[PDB]
């Protein structure tokens, strides 16, 4: 129960339906760079969309697609998805009762409606771009994220990837897994929460992340500490512990949790 | 030329030459203005200014001519 | 002819606008029109006083100065048009200088892409700082910043081009 179509096909549907513009995570810009070219390209997509059957008659678009595309452009609450793994895949999980997931690969964009009965129904969609590895086993530890980012700032500057993690509030039972994530066969995702209340675009300061490595799946959940700074815990990627980490995140927004 | 219009003709003749002197002092600069960049706006507007500068130079040029020949009596 | 500014990356917008001759030619015309507007007003003064170059005896030949007189209204209109052109060019020269200062730098765009490829390489410890989302969100900022400056630089120079 989904629809897959190109960026040119995607942008053209938002214009006729009048939904406006997609979230820029999908980077769905305008096809043509001059308004004299619009006449020709109005015909191409309208001609191509009738082939796929989503735009059957002369201009009437499938209400199923018009609803899915208007909730992605006018979401009241959403979650920005950015997947990484060797290849990037990024999308959005929009909500306006019902939800619609929009993911974009190298060129194609796929729209799909999901269910939000329980907060645990999102663990799949938050792990589609991953490598689908089992929850890892290690001793949970936390780090001040304001200092954690400075660490990666060294690793990407040619620093020995071992002696840095040799100097933190770091345990030893977790050294195997935190070393397997600075590796080749890894895949992670950055989760950012946002909502359009009566004001403008507002997203969270920090984000939630789940990482799949050779050792297993790792959850990286942030939380504001006593002194106002952000501390991030590194625990098992349990499908039960990730859902209690996104509500813990999205509760930072003025409208609170989804539940 | 009549008798008492010698100073009058020399007066009108002295200002039509002063216009042509100022008309040419700015003729090459207002008719060929170069765009400051390459974007389609700097080309469209600098081409419009040049289009105005040449339509203005030809009307004021002949105007000085029609001014200097108004006295036929 | 009728371009869509948000259809192209900020690299092409910044490349076209940031590298050119410069506004030195628009100011060269602005000061030329203003100097040409003072001559149109200056000659209108000595033309309106054409009498006084006529001696006492006017018995006759007043039709001469009366035929050169209607052109003082022409020199006032000419001074007005030439004074407005100096303001049009002066305003167009200011629209460019500000649009350039608002356009994102090409070096600023290059550094953006360079940092994107290295964050994808190693990002585990600093992953709740969401550097991938921010860097990519900082690029679309430059995407919309460039597309907005051009849409305004069009209506700014387009309005500074209409007359009469």
Swiss-Prot record, chain B:
Q: What is its main location?
A: secreted
Effect of knocking it out? PE5-PPE4 double mutant exhibits a severe iron phenotype but secretes EsxG and EsxH normally. Mildly attenuated in vivo.
Q: Which residues form the PE domain?
A: 1-73
Q: Where in the cell is it found?
A: Secreted; Cell envelope; Cell surface
- Keyword Secreted among UniProt keywords: yes
Q: Which UniProt keywords apply?
A: Secreted, Virulence
GO CC field: cell envelope; cell surface; extracellular region
Function description:
Important for the siderophore-mediated iron-acquisition function of ESX-3. May play a pivotal role in the evasion of host immune response by M.tuberculosis. Mediates production of IL-10 via activation of the p38 and ERK1/2 mitogen-activated protein kinase (MAPK) signaling pathways.
* Family (UniProt): Belongs to the mycobacterial PE family.
> How is this protein named in the record?
PE family immunomodulator PE5
Q: Which organism was this protein described from?
A: Mycobacterium tuberculosis (strain ATCC 25618 / H37Rv)
| Boundaries of the shown chain within the full protein | 6 to 78 of 102
Curated annotation (Swiss-Prot), chain C:
Q: What is this protein called?
A: PPE family protein PPE4
Q: Which organism is it from?
A: Mycobacterium tuberculosis (strain ATCC 25618 / H37Rv)
**Part of the whole protein covered:** 2 to 168 of 513
* Highest taxon, organism lineage: Bacteria
Q: Please, what other remarks does the record include?
A: Was identified as a high-confidence drug target.
Q: Family per UniProt?
A: Belongs to the mycobacterial PPE family.
The record's note on what follows loss of this gene reads: PE5-PPE4 double mutant exhibits a severe iron phenotype but secretes EsxG and EsxH normally. Mildly attenuated in vivo.
Query: Which compartments is it annotated to reside in?
Result: Cell membrane
Summary of the function given for this chain in its UniProt record:
Important for the siderophore-mediated iron-acquisition function of ESX-3.
Coiled coil located at which positions? none
* Encoding gene, per UniProt annotation: PPE4
């Amino acid at each position: 129960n989904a629809v897959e179509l190109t960026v040119e096909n995607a942008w053209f549907i938002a214009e006729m339906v009048g939904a406006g513009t997609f979230p820029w995570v999908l980077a769905i810009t305008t096809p043509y760079s001059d308004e004299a070219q619009r006449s020709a390209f109005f015909a191409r997509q309208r001609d191509e969309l009738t082939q796929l059957g989503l735009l059957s008659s002369d201009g009437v678009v499938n209400p199923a697609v018009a609803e899915w595309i208007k909730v992605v452009c006018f979401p009241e609450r959403w979650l920005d998805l950015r997947y990484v793994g060797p290849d990037l895949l990024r999308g959005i999980v929009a909500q306006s009762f019902n939800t619609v997931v929009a993911l974009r690969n190298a060129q194609l964009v796929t729209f799909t409606a999901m269910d939000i009965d329980d907060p645990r129904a999102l663990v799949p969609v938050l792990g589609v771009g991953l490598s689908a590895r089992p929850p890892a086993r290690f001793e949970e530890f936390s780090m001040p994220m304001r200092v954690g980012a400075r660490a990666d700032e060294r690793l990407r500057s040619g620093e020995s990837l071992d002696e840095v993690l040799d100097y933190l509030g770091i345990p030893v039972s977790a050294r195997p897994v935190v070393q397997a994530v600075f590796s080749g066969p890894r895949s992670y995702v950055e989760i950012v929460a946002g909502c359009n209340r009566d004001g403008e675009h507002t997203t969270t300061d920090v984000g939630l992340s789940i990482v799949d490595t050779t050792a297993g799946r790792v959850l990286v959940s942030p939380s504001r500490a006593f002194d106002g700074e952000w501390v991030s815990t590194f625990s098992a990627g349990t499908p039960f512990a990730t859902a209690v980490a996104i509500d813990q995140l999205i509760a930072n927004l003025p409208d609170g949790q989804w539940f | 030329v009549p008798e008492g219009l010698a100073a009058a003709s020399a007066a009108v003749e002295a200002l039509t030459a002063r216009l042509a002197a100022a008309h040419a002092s700015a003729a090459p600069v207002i008719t060929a203005v170069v765009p400051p960049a390459a974007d389609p706006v700097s080309l469209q507007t600098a081409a419009g200014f040049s289009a105005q500068g040449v339509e203005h130079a030809v009307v004021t040029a002949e105007g000085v001519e029609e001014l200097g020949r108004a006295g036929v009596g | 002819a009728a371009p869509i500014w948000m259809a192209s990356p900020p690299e092409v917008h910044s490349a076209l606008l940031s590298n050119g001759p410069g506004p030195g030619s628009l100011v060269a015309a602005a000061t030329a029109w203003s100097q040409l507007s003072a001559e149109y007003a200056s000659t209108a003064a000595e033309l309106s006083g054409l009498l006084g170059a006529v001696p006492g005896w006017a018995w006759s030949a007043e039709w001469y100065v009366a035929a050169h007189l209607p052109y003082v209204a022409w020199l006032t209109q000419a001074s007005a048009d030439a004074a407005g052109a100096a303001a049009q060019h002066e305003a167009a020269a200011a629209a460019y200088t500000t649009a350039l200062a608002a356009m994102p730098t090409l070096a600023e765009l290059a550094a953006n892409h360079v940092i994107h490829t290295v964050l994808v390489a190693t990002n585990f410890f600093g992953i709740n700082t969401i550097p991938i989302t921010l860097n990519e969100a900082d690029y679309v900022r430059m995407w919309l910043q460039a597309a907005a400056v051009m849409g305004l630089y069009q209506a700014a120079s387009g309005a500074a081009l209409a007359s009469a």
